[PDB]
Coordinates of C-alpha atoms and ligand atoms in Angstrom, one line a residue:
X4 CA 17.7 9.8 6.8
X5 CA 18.2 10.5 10.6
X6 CA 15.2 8.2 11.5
X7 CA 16.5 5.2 9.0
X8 CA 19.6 5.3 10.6
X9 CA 18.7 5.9 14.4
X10 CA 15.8 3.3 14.1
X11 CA 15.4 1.7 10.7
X12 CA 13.6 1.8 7.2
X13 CA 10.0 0.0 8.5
X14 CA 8.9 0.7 11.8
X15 CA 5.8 -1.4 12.8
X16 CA 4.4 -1.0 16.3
X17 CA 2.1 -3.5 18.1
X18 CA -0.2 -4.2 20.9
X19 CA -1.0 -7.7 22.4
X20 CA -2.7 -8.7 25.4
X21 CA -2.9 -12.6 26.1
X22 CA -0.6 -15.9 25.0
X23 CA -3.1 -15.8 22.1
X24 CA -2.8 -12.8 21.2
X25 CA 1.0 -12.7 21.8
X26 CA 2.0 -16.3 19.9
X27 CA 0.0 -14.0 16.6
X28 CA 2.2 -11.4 17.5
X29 CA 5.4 -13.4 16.6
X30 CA 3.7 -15.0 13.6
X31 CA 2.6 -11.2 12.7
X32 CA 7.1 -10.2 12.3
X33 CA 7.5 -13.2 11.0
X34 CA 5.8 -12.7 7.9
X35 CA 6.8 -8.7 7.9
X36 CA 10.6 -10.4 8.1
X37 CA 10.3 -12.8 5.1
X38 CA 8.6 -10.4 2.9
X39 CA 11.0 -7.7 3.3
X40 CA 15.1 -6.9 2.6
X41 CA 14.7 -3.7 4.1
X42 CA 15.7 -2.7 7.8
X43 CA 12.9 -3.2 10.6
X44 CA 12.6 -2.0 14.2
X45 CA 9.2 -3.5 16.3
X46 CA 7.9 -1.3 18.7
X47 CA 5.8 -2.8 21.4
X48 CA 3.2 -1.5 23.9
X49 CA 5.4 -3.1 26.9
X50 CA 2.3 -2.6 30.1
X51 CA 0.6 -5.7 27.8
X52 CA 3.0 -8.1 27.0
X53 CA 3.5 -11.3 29.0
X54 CA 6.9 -11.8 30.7
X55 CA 7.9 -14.5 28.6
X56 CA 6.7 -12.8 25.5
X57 CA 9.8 -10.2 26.6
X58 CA 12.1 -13.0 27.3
X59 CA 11.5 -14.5 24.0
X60 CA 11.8 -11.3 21.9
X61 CA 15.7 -10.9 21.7
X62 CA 15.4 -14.5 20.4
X63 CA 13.3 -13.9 17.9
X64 CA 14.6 -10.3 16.6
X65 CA 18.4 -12.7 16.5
X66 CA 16.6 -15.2 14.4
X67 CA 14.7 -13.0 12.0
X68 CA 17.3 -9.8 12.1
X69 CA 15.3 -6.9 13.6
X70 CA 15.4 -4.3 15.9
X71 CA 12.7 -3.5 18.6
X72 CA 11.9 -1.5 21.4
X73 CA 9.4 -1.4 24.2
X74 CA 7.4 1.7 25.1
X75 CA 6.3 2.4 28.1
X76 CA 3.9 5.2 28.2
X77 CA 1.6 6.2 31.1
X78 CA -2.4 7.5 30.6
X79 CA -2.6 11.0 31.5
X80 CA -4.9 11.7 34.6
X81 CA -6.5 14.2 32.9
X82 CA -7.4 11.8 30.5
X83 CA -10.9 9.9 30.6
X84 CA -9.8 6.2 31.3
X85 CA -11.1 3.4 29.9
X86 CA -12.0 0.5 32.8
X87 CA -12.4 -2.3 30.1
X88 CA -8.7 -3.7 29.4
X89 CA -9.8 -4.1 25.5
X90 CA -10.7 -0.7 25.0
X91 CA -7.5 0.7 27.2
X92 CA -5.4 -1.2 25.1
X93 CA -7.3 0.8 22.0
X94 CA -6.5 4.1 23.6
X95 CA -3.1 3.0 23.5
X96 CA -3.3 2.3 19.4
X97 CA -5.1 6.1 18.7
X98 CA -4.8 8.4 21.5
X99 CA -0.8 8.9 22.0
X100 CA 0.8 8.4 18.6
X101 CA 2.8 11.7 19.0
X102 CA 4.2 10.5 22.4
X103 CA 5.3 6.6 22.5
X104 CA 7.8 7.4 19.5
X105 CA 11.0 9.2 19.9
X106 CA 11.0 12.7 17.4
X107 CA 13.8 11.4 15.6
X108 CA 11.2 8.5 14.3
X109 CA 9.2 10.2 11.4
X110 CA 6.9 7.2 10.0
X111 CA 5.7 4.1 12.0
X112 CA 2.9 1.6 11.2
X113 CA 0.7 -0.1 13.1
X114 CA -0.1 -3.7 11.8
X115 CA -2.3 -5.7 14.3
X116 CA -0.7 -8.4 16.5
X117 CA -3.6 -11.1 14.4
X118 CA -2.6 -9.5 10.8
X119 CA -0.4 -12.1 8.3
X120 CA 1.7 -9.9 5.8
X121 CA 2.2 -10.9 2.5
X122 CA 4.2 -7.9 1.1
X123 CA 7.1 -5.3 1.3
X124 CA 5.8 -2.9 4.5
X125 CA 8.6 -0.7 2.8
X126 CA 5.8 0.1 -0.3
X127 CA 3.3 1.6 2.8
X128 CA 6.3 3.6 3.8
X129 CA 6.7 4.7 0.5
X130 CA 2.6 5.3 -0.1
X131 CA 2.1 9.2 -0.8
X132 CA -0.2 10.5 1.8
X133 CA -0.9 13.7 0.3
X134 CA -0.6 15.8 3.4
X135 CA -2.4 13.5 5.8
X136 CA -1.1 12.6 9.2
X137 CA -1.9 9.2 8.9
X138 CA -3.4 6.3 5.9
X139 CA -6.2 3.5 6.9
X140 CA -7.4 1.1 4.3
X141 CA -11.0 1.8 4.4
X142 CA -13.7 -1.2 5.5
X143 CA -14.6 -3.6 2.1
X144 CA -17.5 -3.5 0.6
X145 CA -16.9 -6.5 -1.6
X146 CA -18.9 -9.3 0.3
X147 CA -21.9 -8.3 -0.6
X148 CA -23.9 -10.6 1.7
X149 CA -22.6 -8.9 4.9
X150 CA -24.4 -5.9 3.8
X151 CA -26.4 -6.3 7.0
X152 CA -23.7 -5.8 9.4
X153 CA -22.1 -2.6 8.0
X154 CA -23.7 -0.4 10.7
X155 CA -21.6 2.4 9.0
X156 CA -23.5 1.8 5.4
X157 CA -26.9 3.4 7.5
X158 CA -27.7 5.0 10.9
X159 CA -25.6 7.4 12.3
X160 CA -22.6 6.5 10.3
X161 CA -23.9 6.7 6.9
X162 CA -25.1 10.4 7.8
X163 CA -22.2 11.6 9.9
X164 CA -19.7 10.4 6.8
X165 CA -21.4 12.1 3.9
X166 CA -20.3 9.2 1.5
X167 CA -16.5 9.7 3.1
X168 CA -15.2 6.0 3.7
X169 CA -14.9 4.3 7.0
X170 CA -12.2 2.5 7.7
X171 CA -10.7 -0.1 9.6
X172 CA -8.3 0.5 12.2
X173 CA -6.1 -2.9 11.8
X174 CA -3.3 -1.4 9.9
X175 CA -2.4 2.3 9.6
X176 CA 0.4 4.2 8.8
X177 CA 1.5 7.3 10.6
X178 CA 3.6 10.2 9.1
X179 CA 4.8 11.1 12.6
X180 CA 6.5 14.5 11.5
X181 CA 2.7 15.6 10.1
X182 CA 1.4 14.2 12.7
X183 CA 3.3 16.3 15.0
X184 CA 3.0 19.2 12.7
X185 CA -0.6 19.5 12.6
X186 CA -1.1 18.4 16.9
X187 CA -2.8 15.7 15.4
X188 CA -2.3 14.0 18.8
X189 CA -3.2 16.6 21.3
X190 CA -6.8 17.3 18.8
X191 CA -7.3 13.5 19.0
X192 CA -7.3 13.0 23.0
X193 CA -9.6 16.2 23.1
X194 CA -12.1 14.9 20.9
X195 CA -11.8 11.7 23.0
X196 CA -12.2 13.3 26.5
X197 CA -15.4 14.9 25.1
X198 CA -17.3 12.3 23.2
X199 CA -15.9 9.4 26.2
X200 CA -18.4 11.7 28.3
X201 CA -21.1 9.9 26.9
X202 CA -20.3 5.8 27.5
X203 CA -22.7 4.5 24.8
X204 CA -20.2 6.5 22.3
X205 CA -16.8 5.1 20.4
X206 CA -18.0 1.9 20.7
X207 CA -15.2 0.4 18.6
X208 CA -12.8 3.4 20.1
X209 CA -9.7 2.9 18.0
X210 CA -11.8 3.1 15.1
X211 CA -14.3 5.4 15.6
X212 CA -12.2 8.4 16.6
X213 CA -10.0 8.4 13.3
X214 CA -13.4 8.1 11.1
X215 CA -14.9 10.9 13.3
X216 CA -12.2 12.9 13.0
X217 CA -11.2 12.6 8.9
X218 CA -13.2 16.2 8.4
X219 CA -10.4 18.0 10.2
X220 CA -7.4 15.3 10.3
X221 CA -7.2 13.7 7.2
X222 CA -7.3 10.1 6.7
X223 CA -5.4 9.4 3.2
X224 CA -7.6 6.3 2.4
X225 CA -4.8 3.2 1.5
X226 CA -5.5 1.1 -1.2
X227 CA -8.4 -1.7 -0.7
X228 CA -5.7 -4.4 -0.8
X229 CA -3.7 -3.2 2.1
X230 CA -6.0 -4.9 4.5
X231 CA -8.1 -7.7 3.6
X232 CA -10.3 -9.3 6.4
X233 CA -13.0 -12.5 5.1
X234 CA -16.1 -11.3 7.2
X235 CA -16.1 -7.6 4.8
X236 CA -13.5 -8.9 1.9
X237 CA -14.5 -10.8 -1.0
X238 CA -12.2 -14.0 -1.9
X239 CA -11.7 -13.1 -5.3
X240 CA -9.2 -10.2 -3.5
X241 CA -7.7 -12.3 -0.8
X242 CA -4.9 -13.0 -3.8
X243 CA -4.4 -8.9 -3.9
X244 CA -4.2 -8.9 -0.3
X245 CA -0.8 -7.5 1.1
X246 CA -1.7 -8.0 4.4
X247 CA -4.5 -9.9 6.2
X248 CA -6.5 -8.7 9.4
X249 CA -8.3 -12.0 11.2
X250 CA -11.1 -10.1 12.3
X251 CA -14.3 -11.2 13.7
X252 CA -17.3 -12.4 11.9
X253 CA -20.2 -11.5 13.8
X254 CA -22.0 -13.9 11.5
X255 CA -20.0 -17.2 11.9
X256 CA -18.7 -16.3 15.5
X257 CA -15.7 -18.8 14.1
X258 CA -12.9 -19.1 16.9
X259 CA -9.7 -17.0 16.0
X260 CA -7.4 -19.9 15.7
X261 CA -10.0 -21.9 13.4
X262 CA -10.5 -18.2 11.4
X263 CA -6.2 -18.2 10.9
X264 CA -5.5 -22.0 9.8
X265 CA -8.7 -22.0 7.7
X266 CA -8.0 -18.8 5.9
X267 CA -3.9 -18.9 5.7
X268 CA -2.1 -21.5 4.5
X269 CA 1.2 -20.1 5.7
X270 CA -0.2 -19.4 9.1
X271 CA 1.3 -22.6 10.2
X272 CA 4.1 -22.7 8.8
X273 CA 4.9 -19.7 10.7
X274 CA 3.7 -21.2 13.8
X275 CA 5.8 -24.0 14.0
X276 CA 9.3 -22.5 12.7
X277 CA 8.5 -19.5 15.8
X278 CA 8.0 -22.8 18.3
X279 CA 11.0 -24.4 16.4
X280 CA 12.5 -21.4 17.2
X281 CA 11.5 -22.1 21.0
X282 CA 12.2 -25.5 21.3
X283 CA 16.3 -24.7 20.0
X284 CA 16.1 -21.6 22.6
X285 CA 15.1 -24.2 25.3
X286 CA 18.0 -26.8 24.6
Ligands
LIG1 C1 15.7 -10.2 -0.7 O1 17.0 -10.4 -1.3 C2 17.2 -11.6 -2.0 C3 18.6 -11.7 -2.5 O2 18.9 -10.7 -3.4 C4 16.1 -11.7 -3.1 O3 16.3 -12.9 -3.8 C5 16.6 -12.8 -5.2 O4 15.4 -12.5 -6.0 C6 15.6 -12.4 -7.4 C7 14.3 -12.0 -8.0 O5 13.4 -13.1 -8.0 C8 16.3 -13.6 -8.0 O6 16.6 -13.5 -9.3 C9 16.0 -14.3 -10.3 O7 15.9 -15.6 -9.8 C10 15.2 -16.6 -10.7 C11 15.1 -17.9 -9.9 O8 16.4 -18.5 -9.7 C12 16.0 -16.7 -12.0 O9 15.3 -17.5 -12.9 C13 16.3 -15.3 -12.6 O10 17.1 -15.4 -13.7 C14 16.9 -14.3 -11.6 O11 18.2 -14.7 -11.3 C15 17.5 -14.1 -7.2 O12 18.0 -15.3 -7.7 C16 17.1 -14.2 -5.7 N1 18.3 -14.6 -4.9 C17 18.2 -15.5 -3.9 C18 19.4 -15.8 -3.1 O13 17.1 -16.0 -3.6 C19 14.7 -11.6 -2.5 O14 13.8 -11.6 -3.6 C20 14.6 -10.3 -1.8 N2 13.3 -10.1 -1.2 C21 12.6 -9.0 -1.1 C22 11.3 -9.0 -0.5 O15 13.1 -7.9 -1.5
UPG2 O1 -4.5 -8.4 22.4 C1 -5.7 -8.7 22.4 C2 -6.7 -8.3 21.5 C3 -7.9 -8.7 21.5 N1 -8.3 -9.6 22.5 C4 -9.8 -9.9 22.7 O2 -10.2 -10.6 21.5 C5 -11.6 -10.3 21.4 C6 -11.9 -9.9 19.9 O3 -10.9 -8.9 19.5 P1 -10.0 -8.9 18.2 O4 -9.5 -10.3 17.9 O5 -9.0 -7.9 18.4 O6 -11.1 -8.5 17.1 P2 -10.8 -8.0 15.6 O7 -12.1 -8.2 14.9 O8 -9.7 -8.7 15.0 O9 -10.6 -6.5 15.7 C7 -10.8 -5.6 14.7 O10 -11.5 -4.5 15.2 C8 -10.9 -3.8 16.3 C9 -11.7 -2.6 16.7 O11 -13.1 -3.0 16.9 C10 -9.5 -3.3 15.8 O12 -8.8 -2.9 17.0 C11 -8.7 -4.4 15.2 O13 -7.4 -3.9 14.7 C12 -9.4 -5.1 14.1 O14 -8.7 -6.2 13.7 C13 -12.0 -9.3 22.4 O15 -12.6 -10.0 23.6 C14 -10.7 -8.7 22.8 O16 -10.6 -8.1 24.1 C15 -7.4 -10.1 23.5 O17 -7.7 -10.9 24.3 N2 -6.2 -9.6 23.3
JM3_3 O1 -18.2 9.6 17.1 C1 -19.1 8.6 17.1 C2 -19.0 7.7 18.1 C3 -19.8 6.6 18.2 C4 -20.7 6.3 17.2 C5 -21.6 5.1 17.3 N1 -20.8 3.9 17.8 C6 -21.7 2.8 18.5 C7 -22.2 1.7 17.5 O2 -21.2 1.2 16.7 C8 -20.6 2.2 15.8 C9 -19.9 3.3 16.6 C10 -20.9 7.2 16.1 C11 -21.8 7.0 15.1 C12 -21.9 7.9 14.1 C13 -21.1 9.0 14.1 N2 -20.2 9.3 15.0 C14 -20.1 8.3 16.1
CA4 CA1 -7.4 -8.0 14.4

């Protein structure tokens, strides 16, 4: 239990770019911290974050009793870069897994900076992988009148997949150790390098590259409930939900803000205990 005791029991790393984005990224521990007893360490993407968002983070790991660390990793030369900011920061969520992390961490999950979580991240610790490097809850097909925006149901997808499932990239978890053991990291960039040769491809980059690559590094597909999002999700499983992605609805176009308060009823309740938690910092 080297890597329970050097870090902790959960390990949940991050990325957030923007106050928006960084104000859902408090909310996002938050809920990790009141459904869970066990030991947590945050890892963040440092390059991103805000300067205040730093200043405030010893506050809030004080308040809610965690650890963190920030990681500052830089893009390999050799390695195609991406000139958009959005999909730079989605290298950062596929492309390096084996090399933020220290070796001593074996398991880490990433939980996306908009997700609310509504269980024990100890149970995705737990979650048998049978072998694979890493878990993703695979995209719902439950609302069935969004049928016309799955491009991965037909196309491309739906022939490149053979029936496999394709999965969203909000929340994963990563068995670092198999990760590691199978260069999992060093055959992800690779594939990368090659099929960023071609811009039209990896349009949703952190996504893509794991559901391209589940042939030949597995993907153990999580349980539907893992990651529930409204635009693919039906509501009848919001109430299995253990965690909740804010994704976008390409229908709707419904702000992110609107999309949280609508759909979460604790969202601000969180919200205002973090700025609580500012406005007894400030005095
Ligand atoms: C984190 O640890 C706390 C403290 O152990 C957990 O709270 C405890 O949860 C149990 C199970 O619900 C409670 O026991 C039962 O409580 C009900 C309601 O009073 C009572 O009717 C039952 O007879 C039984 O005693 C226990 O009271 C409760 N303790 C406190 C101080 O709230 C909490 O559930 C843990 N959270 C996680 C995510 O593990
Ligand atoms: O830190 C961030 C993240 C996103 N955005 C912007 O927000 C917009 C929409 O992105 P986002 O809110 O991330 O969309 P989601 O639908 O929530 O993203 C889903 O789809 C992405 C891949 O397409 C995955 O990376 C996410 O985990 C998954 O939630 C874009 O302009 C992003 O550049 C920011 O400004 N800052
Ligand atoms: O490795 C790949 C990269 C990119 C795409 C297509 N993208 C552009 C439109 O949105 C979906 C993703 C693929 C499609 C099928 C099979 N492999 C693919
Ligand atoms: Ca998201």
């Amino acid at each position: 239990s080297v890597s329970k005791t050097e870090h902790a029991e959960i390990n949940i790393f991050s990325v957030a770019s923007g106050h928006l984005y960084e104000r859902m990224l408090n909310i996002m521990m938050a809920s990790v911290m009141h459904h869970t007893n066990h030991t947590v360490k945050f890892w963040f993407i440092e390059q991103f974050l805000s300067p205040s968002f730093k200043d405030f983070i010893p506050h809030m790991a004080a308040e809610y009793g965690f650890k963190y660390e920030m990681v500052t990793y830089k893009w390999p030369h050799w390695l195609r870069q991406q000139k958009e900011k959005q999909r730079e920061i989605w290298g950062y969520k596929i492309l390096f897994l084996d090399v933020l992390f220290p070796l001593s961490l074996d398991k880490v999950i990433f939980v996306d900076a908009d997700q609310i979580v509504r269980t024990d991240m100890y149970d995705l610790v737990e979650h048998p992988l049978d072998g694979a490097p890493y878990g993703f809850a695979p995209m719902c097909d439950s609302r069935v009148e969004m049928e016309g925006y799955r491009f991965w149901k037909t196309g491309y997808w739906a022939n490149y997949l053979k029936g496999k499932p394709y999965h969203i990239s909000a929340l994963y978890v990563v068995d670092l150790q198999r990760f590691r053991e199978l260069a999992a990291g060093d055959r992800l960039r690779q594939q990368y390098h090659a099929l960023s040769a071609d811009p039209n491809s990896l349009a949703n980059l952190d996504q893509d590259l794991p559901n391209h690559m589940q042939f030949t590094i597995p993907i153990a597909t999580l349980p539907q409930e893992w990651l529930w999002c409204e635009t693919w999700c039906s509501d009848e499983t919001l109430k299995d939900a253990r965690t909740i992605d804010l994704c976008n609805n390409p229908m709707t176009k419904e702000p992110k803000l609107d999309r949280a308060r609508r759909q979460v009823p604790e969202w601000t309740k969180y919200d205002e205990e973090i700025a609580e938690l500012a406005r007894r910092v400030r005095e």
